[PDB]
Swiss-Prot record, chain A:
<feature type="glycosylation site" description="N-linked (GlcNAc...) (complex) asparagine; by host">
    <location>
        <position position="20"/>
    </location>
</feature>
<comment type="function">
    <text>Attaches the virion to the cell membrane by interacting with host receptor, initiating the infection. The major receptor is host ACE2. When S2/S2' has been cleaved, binding to the receptor triggers direct fusion at the cell membrane. When S2/S2' has not been cleaved, binding to the receptor results in internalization of the virus by endocytosis using host TFRC and GRM2 and leading to fusion of the virion membrane with the host endosomal membrane. Alternatively, may use NRP1/NRP2 and integrin as entry receptors.</text>
</comment>
<feature type="disulfide bond">
    <location>
        <begin position="29"/>
        <end position="39"/>
    </location>
</feature>
<protein>
    <recommendedName>
        <fullName>Spike protein S1</fullName>
    </recommendedName>
</protein>
<comment type="subunit">
    <text>Binds to host ACE2. RBD also interacts with the N-linked glycan on 'Asn-90' of ACE2. Cleavage of S generates a polybasic C-terminal sequence on S1 that binds to host Neuropilin-1 (NRP1) and Neuropilin-2 (NRP2) receptors. Interacts with host integrin alpha-5/beta-1 (ITGA5:ITGB1) and with ACE2 in complex with integrin alpha-5/beta-1 (ITGA5:ITGB1). May interact via cytoplasmic c-terminus with M protein. May interact (via N-terminus) with host bilirubin and biliverdin, thereby preventing antibody binding to the SARS-CoV-2 spike NTD via an allosteric mechanism.</text>
</comment>
<feature type="region of interest" description="Putative superantigen; may bind T-cell receptor alpha/TRAC">
    <location>
        <begin position="18"/>
        <end position="39"/>
    </location>
</feature>
Length: 43, 49
């Protein structure tokens, strides 16, 4: 048996709700500069 | 104006809000069905004379 513990972090997150309402893709705004631009551009 | 919708609500989710933070779809508490919310028609009135 294997169990992980991915401690959560309070961090802004760009959730891409699909046509169906389920988050399909995403961007972690604080991950790297490219991700941060995507969040600022909201794209 | 209400109308039957086709938005799958999750068991814990009851209200669906709009960009302006306005509910544009609701789930009826009695019958678990999804309704569609749309503001009643409006518009400017112009008098031609
Ligand atoms: C959200 O749900 C709708 C409806 O299922 C998805 O719409 C797209 O609709 C067409 C026609 O239904 C799908 O083609 C196929 O439909 C048949 C049933 O009609 C199904 O058995 C097939 O497996 C196939 O799905 C089309 O695939 C479907 N889109 C997708 C990605 O499956 C809509 O796509 C759903 N949104 C997402 C992001 O999945």
């Amino acid at each position: 048996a294997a169990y992980y513990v991915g401690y959560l972090q309070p961090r802004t997150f760009l959730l891409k709700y699909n046509e169906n309402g389920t988050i399909t893709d995403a961007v972690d705004c604080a991950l790297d500069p490219l991700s941060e631009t995507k969040c600022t551009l909201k794209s | 104006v209400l109308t039957e919708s086709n938005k799958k609500f999750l068991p814990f989710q009851q209200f669906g809000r709009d960009i302006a933070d306005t509910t544009d779809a609701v789930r009826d508490p009695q019958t678990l069905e999804i309704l569609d919310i749309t503001p009643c028609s409006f518009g400017g009135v112009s008098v031609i004379t």
